[PDB]
Amino acid sequence: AALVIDNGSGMCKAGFAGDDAPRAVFPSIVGRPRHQGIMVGMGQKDSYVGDEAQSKRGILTLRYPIEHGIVTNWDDMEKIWHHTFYNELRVAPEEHPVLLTEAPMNPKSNREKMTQIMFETFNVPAFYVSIQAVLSLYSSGRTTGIVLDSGDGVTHVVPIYEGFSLPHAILRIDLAGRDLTDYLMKILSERGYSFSTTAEREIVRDIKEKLCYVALDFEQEMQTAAQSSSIEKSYELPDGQVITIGNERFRAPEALFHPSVLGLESAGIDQTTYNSIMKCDVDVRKELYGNIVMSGGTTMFPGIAERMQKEITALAPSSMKVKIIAPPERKYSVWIGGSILASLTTFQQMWISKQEYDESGPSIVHHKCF
Amino acid sequence: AALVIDNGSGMCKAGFAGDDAPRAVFPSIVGRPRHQGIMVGMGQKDSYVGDEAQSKRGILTLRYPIEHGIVTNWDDMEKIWHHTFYNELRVAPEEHPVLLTEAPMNPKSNREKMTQIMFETFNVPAFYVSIQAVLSLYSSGRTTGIVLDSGDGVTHVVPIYEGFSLPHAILRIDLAGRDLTDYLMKILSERGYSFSTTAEREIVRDIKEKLCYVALDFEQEMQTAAQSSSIEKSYELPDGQVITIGNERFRAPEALFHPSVLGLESAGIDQTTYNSIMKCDVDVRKELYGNIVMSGGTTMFPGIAERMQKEITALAPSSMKVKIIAPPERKYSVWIGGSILASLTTFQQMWISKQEYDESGPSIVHHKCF
Amino acid sequence: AALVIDNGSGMCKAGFAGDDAPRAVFPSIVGRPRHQGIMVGMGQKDSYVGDEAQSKRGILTLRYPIEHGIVTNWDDMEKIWHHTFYNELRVAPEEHPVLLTEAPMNPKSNREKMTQIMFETFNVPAFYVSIQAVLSLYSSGRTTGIVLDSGDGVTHVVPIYEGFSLPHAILRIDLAGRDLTDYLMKILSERGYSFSTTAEREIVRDIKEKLCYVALDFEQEMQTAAQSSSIEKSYELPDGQVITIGNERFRAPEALFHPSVLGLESAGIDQTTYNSIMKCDVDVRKELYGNIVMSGGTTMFPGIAERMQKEITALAPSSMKVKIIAPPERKYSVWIGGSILASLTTFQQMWISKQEYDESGPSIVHHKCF
Amino acid sequence: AALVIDNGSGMCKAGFAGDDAPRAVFPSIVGRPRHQGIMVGMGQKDSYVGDEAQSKRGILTLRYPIEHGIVTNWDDMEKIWHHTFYNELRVAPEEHPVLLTEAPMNPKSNREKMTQIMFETFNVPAFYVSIQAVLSLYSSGRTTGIVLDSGDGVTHVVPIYEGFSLPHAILRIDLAGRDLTDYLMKILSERGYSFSTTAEREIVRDIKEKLCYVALDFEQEMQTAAQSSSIEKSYELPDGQVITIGNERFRAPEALFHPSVLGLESAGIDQTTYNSIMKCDVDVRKELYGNIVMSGGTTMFPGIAERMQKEITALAPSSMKVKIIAPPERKYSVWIGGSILASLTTFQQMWISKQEYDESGPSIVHHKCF
Amino acid sequence: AALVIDNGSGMCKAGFAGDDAPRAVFPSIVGRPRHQGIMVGMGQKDSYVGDEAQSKRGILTLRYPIEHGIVTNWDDMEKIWHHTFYNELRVAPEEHPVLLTEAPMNPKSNREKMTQIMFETFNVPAFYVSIQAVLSLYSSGRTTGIVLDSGDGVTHVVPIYEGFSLPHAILRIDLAGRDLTDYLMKILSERGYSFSTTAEREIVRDIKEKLCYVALDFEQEMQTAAQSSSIEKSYELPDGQVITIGNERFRAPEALFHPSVLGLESAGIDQTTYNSIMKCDVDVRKELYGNIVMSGGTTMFPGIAERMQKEITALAPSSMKVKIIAPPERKYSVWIGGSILASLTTFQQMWISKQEYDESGPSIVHHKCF
Numbered sequence A, B, C, D, E: 001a002a003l004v005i006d007n008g009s010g011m012c013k014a015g016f017a018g019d020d021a022p023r024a025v026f027p028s029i030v031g032r033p034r035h036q037g038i039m040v041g042m043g044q045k046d047s048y049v050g051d052e053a054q055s056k057r058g059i060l061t062l063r064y065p066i067e068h069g070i071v072t073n074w075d076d077m078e079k080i081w082h083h084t085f086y087n088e089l090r091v092a093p094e095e096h097p098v099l100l101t102e103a104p105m106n107p108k109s110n111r112e113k114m115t116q117i118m119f120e121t122f123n124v125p126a127f128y129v130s131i132q133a134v135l136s137l138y139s140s141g142r143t144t145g146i147v148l149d150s151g152d153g154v155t156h157v158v159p160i161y162e163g164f165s166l167p168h169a170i171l172r173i174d175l176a177g178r179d180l181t182d183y184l185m186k187i188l189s190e191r192g193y194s195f196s197t198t199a200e201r202e203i204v205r206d207i208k209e210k211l212c213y214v215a216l217d218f219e220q221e222m223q224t225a226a227q228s229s230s231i232e233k234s235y236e237l238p239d240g241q242v243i244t245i246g247n248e249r250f251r252a253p254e255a256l257f258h259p260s261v262l263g264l265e266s267a268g269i270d271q272t273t274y275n276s277i278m279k280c281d282v283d284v285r286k287e288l289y290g291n292i293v294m295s296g297g298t299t300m301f302p303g304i305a306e307r308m309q310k311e312i313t314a315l316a317p318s319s320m321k322v323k324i325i326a327p328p329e330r331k332y333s334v335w336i337g338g339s340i341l342a343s344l345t346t347f348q349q350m351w352i353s354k355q356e357y358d359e360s361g362p363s364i365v366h367h368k369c370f
């Protein structure tokens, strides 16, 4: 048996290898109370974590300890993994090897410290790290294809061909679900709803996750939303006030396709996907315009696959096939991929041993892990 | 064992912790005789106190030493506490720790001097102070909720969530039972009954406490009382004259809901409750429109909970639940709360020691007490 | 000629373009009488406005019609502008184009309705709106710099570089002079002075505006004010009672730097200034840690510029220059900026014409105005 | 039975003697993967070979192990023959004698090592080597004639008369299909198509093999291609981009006739054919200007036989017959010749025995083989 | 008089013939503003160019219009030449003949369009184009030698002997200063510094240009940098943050010698230099292993000449002299060469006349120019 952990930028996911879904899924938040606890005997916790910090969030400040795939507060990341093992999953980490997951292009000391914690704090017997996107080929059941991952923290494009990683053609893009949440909060001020707080940041996250959709023609839908209320769905806040959302319902996720809206130098996930395909080779692109795998929760918007089709077919060569492979499992495809990978018998020889970590410190990972 | 004292703005309440009701309940009045004592050998007392000063009030002037939760004559407050311990409760204060109670937002030197007296005059071995409203959550058996206290002296609204005190959302309001007594005396002049004296102020207090009720539609009941005597109950004074009370029977307590009648800048206990809920957060209001706890003797009017329902449901968001939690114990809910709090074993480490008061003077309270 | 109006959250300012100061300066208050006018022949006005409502305030309720830069009662805002043109400035609005001013990030329907009134009610011939902070660069005579505005209603940080607005790096912060007034009123209860009324809210505003100052070391000055009366200045109320102000003299404006005191999620104007600089780019920050322009009446506290220096230099990179550009004109720097902008000949082509407002309704502003 | 192997400089060909075509035909390439194989369980092969290395070429580097008829990496040549016997042809080499083929004028240690491998590695029971060109007389069914072979690696002219080899009149010429591929890649840069990679070298090979043709008047067709698009056919790359090919469509194969274009000292296959005929004798040329046999894949261009006619008739004596014997089988004429030769019963006494190789080492070949 | 223009892939250089250095040197960038220009009267330019776009780069997007020696946006190239003549050099192009410069092997329509612009847009009276590398022999004062040019865009190796161009032995290689900048940015992510923007791409260019050096033993210096901080110099960004650079200080320019690091099929400038020498002839190599001229800004790394010595002496024949002729002028050696060439009186008959361009269009260049 082995444990698979998405270590998600947004939702953490964890479970046993060989399962079809993670068992623990919870937001990767640590909540700190921001007020004096006047009532004796409530035993107020000094730091809530996961969905506890959701339920109490009104009295809390919520912080993600992982920003853009970089762990920004390790002591909180420790609290999150501790909660995962003991409270949320109820498993002994000393008994089971752990497959962690990381974004690509990720600062090397992050992968180092990650294993320093996982061995010296949790005493995991054997361990591995793998790239979020790469696992999506396993959950797709494939050996070729270009993966759009788009977590809360990072969008990264990873072309793979015949199990070779084409590492020079990875594009990493900082548009991600968290930044779409923030941009929605920025434009949702246009109707005069104020949501500046982190407790309200979470509400804007729910509004995005439920009511938003990707425009299939941004200018036409801007025109029709200026002409008609047809699009103007309405949401009910945790205080029971109703709000109505105009063209913001799609102007927000359109940021994925014109990042100049966020002022970013980058380019849309469409154009950067195309550009990664252009970058990889002439030989393989025949097999990468088809078989565009797509992954992670930000790729969950309605209409996103259709927009990707339209854009890539507008960028790819004339009479080149395009196929945006978008399962319904996108939100878990990374974890499912890790579950498959850890299941494979032909992988059980690859785990980094605790004994090897005793032979050499965390730097061992840069030798053993790819 | 410990002693719990409401130190009420109106009725004092005192008793032992772990009891279900206070044992000493008496009006917080000191009476001074206002005439020459011509009869030798009666041993006329230079100052009556409590219900002694009730029974003799015709020859006395009655003064409350505590006004709007501020102790205005400490030497009389000393007489009241002395009477409590020795005459009314018959307990040694040197043997028992005392939980006093205070209104919130209360001038800091009041809490200082309160403890300076309680240690240096009464030599109490250990001591604490707590907020009147907060105790009502203990007597409600709760950890969330917004408390309307309305003593004789102060109305104060205190939202609490998960034992955090949301201190920025406390609203303190100077409409209170004493000022309703005075306003009733003002309008009861309209029938030509004169009650200007303090001895008659007490009679107006009894008239209010027995015959008045909160209108559920002030304009409609004004109309029907103009149309019909149906409401016109009658009271019999301590001299046996009968009086009849017209629409004054509800026009007086309606002051709680339109303080412009008293010319106050403030706003009704309904609208200020709603406004405190608006002030606290967006997250918690879901749990504060429900679970509106209500406390203190002025909240005892018939119809007040129904009016609160009507008003808050008229102010709170559409499809937001409202529940005015109004036990029958309202008149003692503060004291019962203190009895529970002092009972808790997990509180016995919090008492301010006499030894600590010897380490630092009364200012110690602002460190130890919250 | 043209008219420039600050439309201030607190003090309104208005005057002609090309002047060095506004001619009309008055508090943006409408006062309603709260009592029966028993004396015949006084001609009592149904609503006083501006400094009339100051002089009569004892019998009035005072309401600001503009809250946090949002016009909350347009009919009163109309009364304020009407008073400005006809009573206070004595100018015909039909004859002169008007430059209004708005806070940034401000609800879009506010800017719409603002122009709907300005054309259809006042028949202004041509019109414009501009961001309060942006004008401060004109009154500084600059084309780069980050502006702290802090009116009565809104603190907003606006970085500008080479005349490009870096709109993604605007931080809007709800700490402002009005909320410092309210917090001072909250803590000034600690000495037992009660000022709950709006008529007394104005007195607390004067106390703040005269006697308060920003602490340069909050903990040290708390210590020394606990040790010594050296800081304890005294104020004389409009009734001639004297009051003394302890550490409240600086504990109140310290709210600008630890908003957790107000329970706000936000962060101090120092840390949010630094964070806006971090947000804008890597290229320009060299020119924004220097040239921190500062604006609006809340930035008028003694010691505030020194504290900003200390904090930003504690946050900015080592060996990065910091310069808090704080003229004496701060209280008018917005209006002076508008006066310059309206003066420029190279701006006279930008006014929204009445003819254009006849071609398209108030929504025209979102096209013409930036 | 016997096995016949062309050991081609470009396409390998192998099959059984007495067949009319080779059964295994595949490019003589070994492909090495050039990237990290990140996917576990694909079993990535350390070296692909033949048409496997075609299909995967995008991730590979492709190397021919035989350059200009010289085996440049014997370990790869071993892999190619191993693939031929076991994977591609599925035959046991221990059971069948093998006729290998070599270019003429070829470094003697090549023929030595070739047999050292064929006996000691593959344990072939009996063996022979013969000259590529000479076999073409057998597949032509002739005993006189001059053979232009032009493989990928070597052009060599071999006059034969009455079965005597005229060995002093062999001309060996290093213009060959591979070098025409490279030159086409050089000039195809003139339109700005870049194909520098070996994976793209293969694409240029396909472009040459499909669209190019030999000009029948190079200057006139240069003129007409400058005048008109009539010649400008278009190709579609493996990525689906279209390209158009101008005069490059014939300027490339014209290198065979003006090698000064490649900067080579040599002379065209026309002039070197004529010069070999001049070199051989006066007696036989009557039978060699007629009966110019032509062989190998580079002789497959459209128009090449017509150009040979024009050139040789311009060089050969007046009133001398010229006949360029160009079957359609040119691409296999060598192998078919070997199939006939190995078929002949009057050849079965000529095989080098394994027993003879045990009597004397590989040097035995220079005695037995001619 | 005549004007000489390097038309550099990276830094443009221009000046008068007969000077010892170019007078205008500036980066060949056009900058477009990426934000709304809110300040009236700044006259914001729609496109900055050269070192203007450096100074303002924080608000710009920077694009090179020339990629790998191919002009990719002619309208921007026009802006660059216009800036050169009028703003940066302040010369009338109608009065002076212009020597432009091009990379070799360069798409023929580029040289065409280049002259179409130079005559029809700038009305230059007479004109020429020459190969970047070839000019380096003039600035070396030589008639033999093999030139490594390595601009920002192209590395190209050009052997020349006795003034004959050996055109079949030119090797063109796409490793160049821009791609080393990009690779440094890729590995500099390993320390967690993010520089993905073009504005930050320029900063990575400065970091490379100042702190990087070519390793003389890549494995040994990797070992010693793993053992010791001795190499770990530090840079200070335009925001004043310090960074430290580990083995990246040499791992980046090592890409020139193992392009497999960039995944390129190509081979190091050492091995490709050797291979060009192998390709040219047997006669001349005696004079090309000596007299390896070296050119262009990418050849400016410390240690590069020593590494070239080590590698070429490891590849060249035993007891063959090797001499890497590396002046200090490398960064300008092309321009200086053009200055000499345009100076020569025996060149003044070679200019393409405007009259000849009127006789035949831009295709004239392919006749006149070599």
Ligand SMILES: Nc1ncnc2c1ncn2[C@@H]1O[C@H](COP(=O)(O)OP(=O)(O)O)[C@@H](O)[C@H]1O
Binding pocket: A006, A007, A008, A009, A010, A011, A012, A150, A151, A152, A153, A177, A178, A181, A205, A208, A209, A210, A296, A297, A298, A299, A300, A301, A302, A331, A334
């Ligand atoms: N149905 C949905 N519509 C729009 N956005 C969604 C939806 N579901 C999830 N998301 C976005 O995806 C985020 C989760 O991303 P996740 O896959 O957990 O990142 P990671 O892969 O790093 O764990 C959510 O917080 C939300 O912002």
Ligand SMILES: Nc1ncnc2c1ncn2[C@@H]1O[C@H](COP(=O)(O)OP(=O)(O)O)[C@@H](O)[C@H]1O
Binding pocket: B006, B007, B008, B009, B010, B011, B012, B150, B151, B152, B153, B177, B178, B181, B205, B208, B209, B210, B296, B297, B298, B299, B300, B301, B302, B331, B334
């Ligand atoms: N049944 C009743 N109806 C109306 N008013 C009442 C009733 N009972 C008590 N009150 C009011 O409540 C007052 C007592 O308030 P109390 O709770 O003693 O204040 P505190 O909480 O400060 O002790 C009485 O004096 C009277 O004015």
Ligand SMILES: Nc1ncnc2c1ncn2[C@@H]1O[C@H](COP(=O)(O)OP(=O)(O)O)[C@@H](O)[C@H]1O
Binding pocket: C006, C007, C008, C009, C010, C011, C012, C150, C151, C152, C153, C177, C178, C181, C205, C208, C209, C210, C296, C297, C298, C299, C300, C301, C302, C331, C334
């Ligand atoms: N000298 C001062 N010291 C402290 N606070 C001041 C001083 N002068 C003005 N203020 C504060 O600034 C407020 C005015 O802000 P103002 O600039 O009018 O806002 P706006 O920019 O929206 O018009 C005053 O009401 C007061 O609260």
Ligand SMILES: Nc1ncnc2c1ncn2[C@@H]1O[C@H](COP(=O)(O)OP(=O)(O)O)[C@@H](O)[C@H]1O
Binding pocket: D006, D007, D008, D009, D010, D011, D012, D150, D151, D152, D153, D177, D178, D181, D205, D208, D209, D210, D296, D297, D298, D299, D300, D301, D302, D331, D334
């Ligand atoms: N139809 C064609 N047109 C032009 N060139 C061709 C054609 N067919 C084959 N070739 C060239 O001939 C090459 C094969 O030569 P080949 O006969 O295999 O050499 P060898 O005789 O050494 O085996 C091909 O790779 C290609 O370059």
Ligand SMILES: Nc1ncnc2c1ncn2[C@@H]1O[C@H](COP(=O)(O)OP(=O)(O)O)[C@@H](O)[C@H]1O
Binding pocket: E006, E007, E008, E009, E010, E011, E012, E150, E151, E152, E153, E177, E178, E181, E205, E208, E209, E210, E296, E297, E298, E299, E300, E301, E302, E331, E334
């Ligand atoms: N001292 C240096 N160290 C390392 N690299 C340098 C140095 N000087 C210049 N370069 C590189 O050379 C580039 C300039 O190349 P350049 O000669 O202008 O190309 P071109 O020959 O096409 O004009 C610089 O942008 C930089 O990348």
Ligand SMILES: [Mg+2]
Binding pocket: A006, A007, A008, A009, A010, A132, A151, A296, A334
């Ligand atoms: Mg994930």
Ligand SMILES: [Mg+2]
Binding pocket: B006, B007, B008, B009, B010, B132, B151, B296, B334
């Ligand atoms: Mg009480």
Ligand SMILES: [Mg+2]
Binding pocket: C006, C007, C008, C009, C010, C132, C151, C296, C334
């Ligand atoms: Mg203002």
Ligand SMILES: [Mg+2]
Binding pocket: D006, D007, D008, D009, D010, D132, D151, D296, D334
């Ligand atoms: Mg062959």
Ligand SMILES: [Mg+2]
Binding pocket: E006, E007, E008, E009, E010, E132, E151, E296, E334
């Ligand atoms: Mg150059």
